[PDB]
Amino acid sequence: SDAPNFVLEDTNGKRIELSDLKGKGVFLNFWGTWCEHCKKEFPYMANQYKHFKSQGVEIVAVNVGESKIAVHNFMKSYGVNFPVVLDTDRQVLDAYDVSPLPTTFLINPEGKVVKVVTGTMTESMIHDYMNLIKPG
């Protein structure tokens, strides 16, 4: 099933479009700075990103509409090294029908959603999930 396309700004100004990431696996994450999951899991994502980025797995972590300053503070506290985008009007959040937070969509290189993860993730789970969507 196809991942609704979108264009948002990363936390540096850079226009990120989802369909431009075709050819790579996308670990797509919707998150808020108040979520217990994300405080635990963000350091794991950062540590697994060190290994997977050069294999063709990209992270897009869509913050659900909070201020740039809350976002920046969270990124700094939790060692974030990956792409964060700011869904400022909440309209990507809607296109994706996101209910619990966080939710992770695992998008393969063709642009299709192969899993929706709504539960807690261990660092091992995250490793496995990135192996599922990598080109190799």
Neighbours of 13 (CB within 10 A): 6
Query: Residue 25 is part of which domain span?
Result: 1-136
The count of structural domains within the chain is 1
Q: Are 104 and 27 in contact (CB under 8 A)?
A: yes
* Side-chain half-sphere exposure of 25, counting CA atoms within 13 A: 22
DSSP symbols for 49-102: HHHHGGGTEEEEEEE-S--HHHHHHHHHHTT--S-EEE-TTSHHHHHTT--SSS
28 has which bridge partners? 60, 105
Read off the CATH number of the domain in which 15 is found: 3.40.30.10
* Side-chain half-sphere exposure of 19, counting CA atoms within 13 A: 5
Technique employed here was X-ray
